[PDB]
Design a protein around this nucleic acid. Structure first.
Ligand SMILES: [Mg+2]
Ligand SMILES: [Zn+2]
Ligand SMILES: [Zn+2]
Ligand SMILES: [Zn+2]
Lengths: 151, 61, 192, 257, 214, 91, 133
RNA sequence: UUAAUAUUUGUUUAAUGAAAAGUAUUUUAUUAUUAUAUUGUAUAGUAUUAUUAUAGUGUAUAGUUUUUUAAAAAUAUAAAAAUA
């Protein structure tokens, strides 16, 4: 993300609406997922013992200044703003997963699973029954051939 | 005489080259040993501008 | 002038093709490409004599007959073969024909090798190979006896190895006891 | 949708800007990584100095970077100077990264593993407090007489923060090419790393033999037979290294400690 | 190597530690992304003379070994030089490439065992004996202590076969106990420094020291 | 490239760049089995160090001998005795 | 055009100089790797004597009966000694016009390198690579 | 005059003994061994320091060390897509 030099409400809304495109991202995921988090930034954060988006969001402005003007992290402000912007829905995902659960429901989850297994069993039962009918028709052909040979 | 002289010259050249290569490898190993000693004494580590925490993480090798 | 040579990052095959130096373990094909008066590559030393002769004699008396390609494939199928190429096989068979060991008779459309001149000596060599196989079986029985002897020797080795383990662990134990006595001798005096 | 008025990658002029139109264009390799850049006359590429082929150009670049890391500076000519400066920046970037892949890449590129080690030892601590532009390029007012090409002095910036080359003076070269470089009067008591000192001592003692004097006179004879002017006769030449000169140079080296 | 990112939380390897490597605490909610876990690159361990000799000494102590209990035996060994199970696996691979040890599979227990090759068994025995003599020369004791140790060694030698086996089991379990106790007082620091050989290849030179921790 | 020891046949792999084309035929390298400096010969060919222009990283690629040499020392039947101790994918 | 591979791969069966190594005409020990004064003729066979190829000295690679060089650089093993084809076939002793007591042959299997065993050795070795197992 | 011309441009060496040919001021060229007078050892040719390894033996890892230049047209080589 460019941000043109400063993080704005449009960038925060961008991150918020892109949070849908990452359902498996928890508040405890690694720091390389945040935008503009290069290898230098990630190594400096690991030196600071920062392995988590929560630990990035819990940083202080003085620590961010130290990381940006004494360590060499250019987009440290952008990484920190991204973390602070996305940290609040991540806590909800971790504690309950509200936006992920209230829209589907365990009832619909189990319904989908049961219908999936029933359809998968029916697909094979169709072939089982058609093979049974084929064997029955083969036996009927054998009986008809025996009758014709007797005739 | 030509055959024997040529073979002897080539053999002696090969042996001198082997000795030279062995000595140079030994000297380079001693050089690396002295370099490691000096780096450990002065605190220099050729593991980047970072500290030992990055190597402990060993996410980059 | 070559694109592979002008390319900034040369491949290993491209660097091999530049090994025109007459040296040990060099590019033999790139050194053979240049004339014989330029490259010092003498004729191929092909080992002839009884070593390939008896081998091909056994392998041919087994089948009696086989074509040249079939003989080469059957030989290559094995592991130990004194023959390096089908041309080597051809030269060995030609020398054997000259010495009246094998004779090649042409069928409707192909040639097959047979043993008709030394058929008695061929059967003698086959019986010698069979007796060598029987001696190999007897040596395998002797190797089973020597394996029982080696099991006894391995029991002795296990004895000396457990003795070495005891004398080592006792050394490690006393070293650790000395270290613990240096640090806090209370645990050392408790263990005695 | 339609196509641009000029479709496909068409070579533009040297000073023509970008077009910013949808065009399927592929790069030869990933040039974003250090020492893997491409040479060209567009702005996205390094200025390709003259060479018989891209392979020859890369070989020239490798020897340039090797000598640059060796003696902390290099006097080059023409379009070689921007490429040398950018590649020195790339080397410093790899050294500050300090990965095993970075070590292996700098070893693949350089001609000297000892120089690879020297770079990875010195450059991190030397340019830890710098963001970019680790090398300085100065266009000289004197030109190479043979081809009238513009000369450029390329060097590294943090001279004082370095272990080697601490206090070295480049206003004038040494007395001999095998002697240690000049040192300012203020930094006379400086000390060099022992491994680099031993390497330099070995390379310098290489030239203290009589076979080198024979090579020197034979080079005089060769360049005189090849038509090169202002080359004296091997009878009039004199050795670069003698006993009394070596004695006084050893005295000066012990003075500089 | 950290306890949370490279291994599940709560586990720890009782072995030599790397010098100046901080054992920083990683939160429990830490998890790697499926794409980020692929591009992880570990530093190369030391498969050199000291680690291969240590592993060969363990494999000579336990004749034969099994790949499951090999790490436990290495941890019980007093002078452990291995860093972790990755270092152990790399040293095993190097020994297999050099031909010191071979890997077989028992058809009874369906498990992989590590046997010592017949051609290299003599060199392994020589290395073990040299290491024993070096440990004896380095170990310090008074006259009475040396006399008591010699008497105990003579008694263990004069003991019977099964008596010697039970004595060896007791001795190795007491060695394991005293090593677990002494580890709390001192550890083994492994230090490394990369360099490049004349062939342009990057390899590390390693030092192994012992440092007291209180 | 893949090199073997002249004395014992120990084999190790290492890519050769354009700065070491002179050392592609014969390498004077320290042998871990011989425990001293031995001469190494060129055995099989690897792809390359750099990249072929407008060609992927796989081009050209190693020969069948290099691919077979790797598969015998690291693969399904090779890492199976080693997957029970550490499972290299993990620590 | 040459129709033979270069740098024969010995990954299937490595061809190395043995520690103990005697001659065929001489039955005396030779230098192992320090000097290439010997002549190595490898064929990938453990057949006695001197498995994975016998060895000859440069000076002694000559026929043992007539003490002369070889015609086409091809010797004949005769009860442990190396003879020439005119000697083995029973023809008269022919003095060559060229060098008498030494033959044109390279050192350290350089002349016998372009022919022999290459990669792959057997058919079951290729299917080992192309199969996932 | 062409001619502000064409042409040259010296930044990286993979190979080993004669004779014809060449006479270039080898100041004592070599320093010695053996024995035994005398005699002679360095450099081609194609009008040149030129597309040039004179193939008489012989075999070999000594890297056995002179090729400028910052965009273009035409031309010369080499490569040149999931179109035919
Ligand atoms: Mg001429
Ligand atoms: Zn070896
Ligand atoms: Zn011989
Ligand atoms: Zn003969």
């Amino acid at each position: 993300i460019a941000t043109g030099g400063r993080v704005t409400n449009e960038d925060r809304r961008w991150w918020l609406v892109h949070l849908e495109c990452a359902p498996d991202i928890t508040p405890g995921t690694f720091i390389a997922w945040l935008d503009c988090c290069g290898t230098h930034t990630c190594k400096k954060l690991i030196e600071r013992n920062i392995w988590t988006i929560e630990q990035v969001a819990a940083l202080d402005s003085d620590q961010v200044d130290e990381l940006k003007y004494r360590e060499g992290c250019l987009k440290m402000d952008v990484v920190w703003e991204h973390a602070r912007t996305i940290i609040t829905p991540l806590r909800q995902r971790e504690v309950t997963g509200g936006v992920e659960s209230e829209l589907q429901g365990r009832i619909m989850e189990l319904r989908k699973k049961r219908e999936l297994e029933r359809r998968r069993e029916e697909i094979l039962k169709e072939r089982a029954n058609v093979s049974e009918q084929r064997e029955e028709t083969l036996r009927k052909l054998r009986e008809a051939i025996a009758a014709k040979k007797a005739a | 005489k030509r055959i024997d002289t040529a073979k002897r010259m080539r053999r002696d050249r090969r042996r001198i080259e082997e000795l030279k290569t062995l000595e140079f490898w030994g000297w380079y190993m001693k050089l690396q040993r002295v370099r490691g000693r000096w780096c450990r004494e002065q605190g220099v580590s050729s593991r980047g501008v970072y500290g030992p925490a990055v190597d402990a993480a060993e996410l980059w090798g | 002038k070559e694109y592979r040579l002008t390319v900034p990052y040369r491949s290993e095959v491209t660097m091999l093709r530049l090994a025109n130096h007459k040296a040990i373990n060099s590019n033999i094909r790139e050194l053979f490409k240049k004339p014989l008066v330029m490259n010092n590559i003498k004729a191929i030393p092909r080992d002839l004599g009884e070593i390939p002769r008896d081998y091909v004699l056994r392998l041919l008396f087994f089948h009696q007959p086989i074509r040249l390609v079939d003989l080469w494939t059957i030989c290559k199928e094995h592991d130990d073969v004194p023959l390096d190429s089908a041309k080597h096989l051809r030269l060995v068979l030609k020398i054997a024909k000259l010495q009246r060991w094998v004779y090649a008779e042409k069928n409707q459309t192909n040639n097959l090798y047979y043993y008709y001149v030394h058929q008695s000596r061929m059967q003698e060599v086959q019986q010698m190979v069979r007796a060598s196989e029987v001696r190999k079986k007897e040596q395998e029985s002797v190797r089973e006896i020597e394996a029982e002897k080696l099991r006894m020797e391995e029991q002795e080795r296990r004895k000396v190895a457990l003795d070495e383990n005891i004398v080592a662990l006792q050394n490690a134990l006393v070293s650790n006891i000395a270290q613990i006595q240096e640090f806090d001798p209370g645990f050392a005096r408790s263990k005695i | 949708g339609r196509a641009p008025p000029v479709i496909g990658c068409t070579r533009k002029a040297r000073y023509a800007g970008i077009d910013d139109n949808p065009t399927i264009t592929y790069k030869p390799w990933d040039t974003t990584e250090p020492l893997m850049a491409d040479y060209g006359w567009t702005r996205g590429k390094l200025p390709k100095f003259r060479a018989r082929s891209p392979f020859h150009r890369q070989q020239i670049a490798r020897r340039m970077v090797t000598e640059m890391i060796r003696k902390d500076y290099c006097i080059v000519g023409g379009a070689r100077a921007p490429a040398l400066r950018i590649l020195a920046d790339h080397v410093v970037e790899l050294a500050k990264a300090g990965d095993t892949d970075s070590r292996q890449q700098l070893a693949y590129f350089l001609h000297d593993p000892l120089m690879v080690d020297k770079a990875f030892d010195e450059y991190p601590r030397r340019f830890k407090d710098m963001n970019a532009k680790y090398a300085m390029m100065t266009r000289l007012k004197s030109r190479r007489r043979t081809d009238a090409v513009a000369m450029y002095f390329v060097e590294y910036k943090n001279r004082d923060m370095s272990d080697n080359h601490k206090g070295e003076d480049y206003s004038a070269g040494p007395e001999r090419f095998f002697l240690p470089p000049r040192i300012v009067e203020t930094e006379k008591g400086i000390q060099r790393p022992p491994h680099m000192q031993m390497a330099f001592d070995r390379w310098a003692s290489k030239f203290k033999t009589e076979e080198f004097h024979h090579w020197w006179r034979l080079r005089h004879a060769k360049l005189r037979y090849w038509g090169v002017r202002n080359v004296p006769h091997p009878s009039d030449v004199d050795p670069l290294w003698t006993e009394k000169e070596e004695e006084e140079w050893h005295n000066e080296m012990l003075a500089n400690t | 190597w950290q306890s949370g990112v490279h291994t599940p939380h709560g586990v720890v390897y009782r072995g030599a530690k790397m010098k100046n490597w901080p054992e920083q605490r990683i939160p429990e909610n830490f998890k790697f992304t499926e794409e980020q876990r692929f591009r992880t690159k570990a530093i190369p361990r030391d498969v050199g003379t000291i680690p291969r000799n240590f592993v060969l000494g363990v494999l000579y102590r336990h004749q034969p070994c099994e790949v499951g209990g090999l790490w436990e035996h290495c941890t019980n060994d007093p002078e452990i030089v291995l860093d972790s199970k990755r270092h152990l696996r790399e040293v095993l691979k190097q020994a297999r490439e050099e031909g010191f040890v071979t890997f077989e599979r028992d058809a009874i227990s369906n498990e992989w065992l590590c046997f010592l090759t017949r051609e290299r068994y003599e060199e392994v025995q020589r290395i073990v004996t040299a290491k024993s003599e070096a440990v004896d020369t380095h170990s310090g004791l008074r006259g009475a202590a040396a006399t008591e140790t010699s008497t105990y060694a003579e008694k263990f030698r004069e003991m019977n076969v099964e008596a010697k086996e039970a004595h060896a089991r007791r001795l190795e379990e007491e060695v394991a106990n005293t090593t677990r106790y002494l580890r709390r007082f001192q550890q083994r620091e492994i230090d490394y420094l990369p360099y490049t050989d004349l062939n342009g290849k990057v390899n590390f030179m390693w030092w192994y020291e012992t440092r007291d921790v209180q | 490239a893949l090199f073997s020891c002249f004395r014992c046949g120990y084999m190790y792999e290492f890519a050769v760049s354009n700065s070491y084309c002179r050392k592609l035929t014969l390498r004077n390298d320290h042998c871990p089995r011989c425990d001293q400096l031995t001469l190494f010969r060129f055995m099989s060919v690897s792809g390359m160090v750099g990249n072929m222009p407008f060609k992927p990283i796989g081009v050209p690629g190693p020969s069948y001998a290099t691919l077979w040499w790797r598969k015998t020392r690291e693969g399904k039947e090779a890492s199976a005795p080693l997957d029970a101790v550490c499972k290299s994918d993990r620590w | 055009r040459p129709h033979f591979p270069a740098y024969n791969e010995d990954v299937d069966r490595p061809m190395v100089v043995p520690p103990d190594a005697i001659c065929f005409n001489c039955d005396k020990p030779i230098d192992a790797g320090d000097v290439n004064s010997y002549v190595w003729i490898p064929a990938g066979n453990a057949t006695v004597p001197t498995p994975q190829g016998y060895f000859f000295h440069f000076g002694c690679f000559k026929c043992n009966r007539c003490k002369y060089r070889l015609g086409h650089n091809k010797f004949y093993s005769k009860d442990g000694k190396a003879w020439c084809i005119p000697c083995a076939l029973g023809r008269d002793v022919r003095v060559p016009t060229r060098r008498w007591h030494t033959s044109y042959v390279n050192t350290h299997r350089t002349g016998s390198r372009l022919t022999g065993h290459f990669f792959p050795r057997h058919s079951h070795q290729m299917e080992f690579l192309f199969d996932p197992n």
